[PDB]
Design a protein around this ligand. Structure first.
Ligand code: IQJ
Ligand code: MG
Ligand code: ZN
Length: 313
């Protein structure tokens, strides 16, 4: 009832900014998340005891991989918190509840390998889920944890509201499959430029939440340069391990995944900013103008990768 989470002053101010970094203190991350839920959603949204038990079971089901870990989950949830806080009136009660949970859960039980690697390995999950393999797995783990004893944070919702929130979470988690992003963003780009984008149209809201999910998921490219650059090392630590596992299956990995091609990382980042990141934050900014700081920070980081190529660092 009367129990608020409060943070130290620097975190209390910086957490509202898009480029906030959650810090190296793992034990403070549950508190930062509950803080965000309380301000994004209400202190009434969830029973504290149930939400705490849920967060700790979610944490326990993230693995100790270099990038797709608990720290990525909380980071992606913080970006969603900053989008929601800058767009107060655009989103429903169920959406505010569902989307922070979706973000915390979106990579549950990730092993550090792409959908492609599971399909080439012939992983059991690639028979159970023929597309968006890992994302259907993450949603499955989310429903699992929701059904543990004392972990139902949506218990106060009706049957039909519960079903709507699990459908928000399902679509939001599926949308983090970057293979689906290209087409989603093209459709949003055409819809916004013919002026047919309508936020009372459920299929349209769905697409706009999908693009938010991509934006939050990629938000390492919207941080201050030293955070962006050190995160990129964790991302490539995973990619290069996948490359090694590809070579164990007798397959030349794509260069993105080949550690022998470490030299090509700056040019690889240019391709990624130009083909994915910049277009993502561009279309997001057209639909939700107060998200422009993510586009600005992404452009600042592309310019830093351009300097790495020109040997100015
Ligand atoms: C020599 C050469 O081609 N290097 C290349 N590097 C890349 C890097 C990316 N992608 C990324 O760098 C990335 C992702 C990303 O794709 N994710 C999938 C799971 C997180 C999320 N954030 N960031 C920065 C894509 C294509 C290429 S080709
Ligand atoms: Mg993922
Ligand atoms: Zn992710």
């Amino acid at each position: 009832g009367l129990m608020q989470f409060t943070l130290p002053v620097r975190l209390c101010k910086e957490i509202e900014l898009f480029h906030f970094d959650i810090g190296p203190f793992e034990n403070m991350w549950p508190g930062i998340f509950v803080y965000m839920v309380h301000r994004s959603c209400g202190t009434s949204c969830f029973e504290l005891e149930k939400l705490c038990r849920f967060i700790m079971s979610v944490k326990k089901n993230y693995r100790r991989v270099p990038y797709h870990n608990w720290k990525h989950a909380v980071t992606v949830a913080h970006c969603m918190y900053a989008i929601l806080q800058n767009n107060h009136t655009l989103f429903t009660d169920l959406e505010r509840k569902g989307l922070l949970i979706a973000c915390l859960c979106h990579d549950l039980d990730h092993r550090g390998f792409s959908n492609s690697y599971l399909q080439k390995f012939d992983h059991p999950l690639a028979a159970l889920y023929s597309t968006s393999t890992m994302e259907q797995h993450h949603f499955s783990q989310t429903v699992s944890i929701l059904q543990l004893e004392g972990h139902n944070i949506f218990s106060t919702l009706s049957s039909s509201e519960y079903e709507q929130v699990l459908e928000i979470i399902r679509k939001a988690i599926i949308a983090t499959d970057l293979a689906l992003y290209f087409g989603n963003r093209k459709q949003l780009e055409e819809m916004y430029q013919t002026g047919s984008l309508n936020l009372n149209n459920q299929s349209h809201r769905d697409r706009v939440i999908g693009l938010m999910m991509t934006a939050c998921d990629l938000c390492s490219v919207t941080k201050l340069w030293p955070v962006t650059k050190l995160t990129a090392n964790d991302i490539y630590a995973e990619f290069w391990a996948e490359g090694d596992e590809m070579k164990k299956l007798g397959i030349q990995p794509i260069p993105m995944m080949d550690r022998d091609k470490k030299d090509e990382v700056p040019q690889g980042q240019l391709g990624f900013y130009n083909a994915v990141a910049i277009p993502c934050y561009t279309t997001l900014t057209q639909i939700l103008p107060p998200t422009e700081p993510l586009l600005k920070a992404c452009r600042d980081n592309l310019s830093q990768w351009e300097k790495v190529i020109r040997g100015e660092e």
